[PDB]
Amino acid sequence: RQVLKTDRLVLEPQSMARFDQWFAMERQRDEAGHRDLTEDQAWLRLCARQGMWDAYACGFYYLLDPVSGEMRGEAGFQFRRRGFGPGFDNHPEAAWAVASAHQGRGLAAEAMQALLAHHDRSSQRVVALIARSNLPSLRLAERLGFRGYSDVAFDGAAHLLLERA
Amino acid sequence: RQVLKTDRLVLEPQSMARFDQWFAMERQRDEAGHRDLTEDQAWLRLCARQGMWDAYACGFYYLLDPVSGEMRGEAGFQFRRRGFGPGFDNHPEAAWAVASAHQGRGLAAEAMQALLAHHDRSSGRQRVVALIARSNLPSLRLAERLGFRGYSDVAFDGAAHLLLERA
């Protein structure tokens, strides 16, 4: 499980060792399912991330500052069973999120460009789930090669299912 | 990971490979947090069980019938941060459940006796804990028989619960 290096980041496969640090970042993310996580919920979420790596040998990465070790966000792949059928459930699904104090600096683009280039060599068609109201993420997703193929409701809101071949 | 065998059970470390079979067992368990898991919640819970094995080299096992191959339950160790304090959170916590149809035959005891002895050999006999509802008499008795003693109480999930420890 190797660490990747970009111009400004180290990307380190997620594991239990950075739990406290990752948990503080979740708490600072002003969004239901993050700001209101209990410690046991967060812990189980991170355990699942580590399980993904053990089972499929890919998953999520911490975005770290190479000098301070500061956690600037997270990005990578997950297998989920959200119920959007067989072309979406159990496929590698890309997701990313930059920490609150660290946004607007092209960190997400830079991390995902490296993850996707890497994923292309290891493997596959990659999918993503993005709210139709989230214009900047959909902008970034299109630049990364993702194309909207289906709209669904998720959390009683319109979302797109996207795919990148 | 090492499959363990008892007189009446095959104990297989839990992995994603048995997700369909394990998910169907969880849904026939008549208890909040089990009967009412979405497939995605069940999937994340089993991913977390594999994560546990990866980080700590111990965790949960499927209990399989040596004759039919059907799953009779699950037992083992888990690592949790429920907020009961450093005496309890992040220690191997023992837990077990047998499908209702096969309860009352000593299955949980047989699985747990065997998992504890294996644990003792591997990590050289560290303290193990358990969380059990005060109103769950059978389960408290089993726990006493496996070496566990209550040392504290907490409210959890609407109800009084004991913290138990062994060794």
From TrEMBL, chain B:
Lineage: superkingdom: Bacteria
Q: Which Pfam families match?
A: Acetyltransf_3
Q: Which residues form the N-acetyltransferase domain?
A: 9-167
Q: Which Gene3D superfamilies match?
A: 3.40.630.30
What is a GO molecular function of this protein? Answer: acyltransferase activity, transferring groups other than amino-acyl groups
Segments forming a coiled coil:
none
- The entry's protein name is Probable GnaT-family acetyltransferase
Organism of origin is Bordetella pertussis (strain Tohama I / ATCC BAA-589 / NCTC 13251)
Tell me the classification of the organism that encodes this protein.
Answer: Bacteria, Pseudomonadati, Pseudomonadota, Betaproteobacteria, Burkholderiales
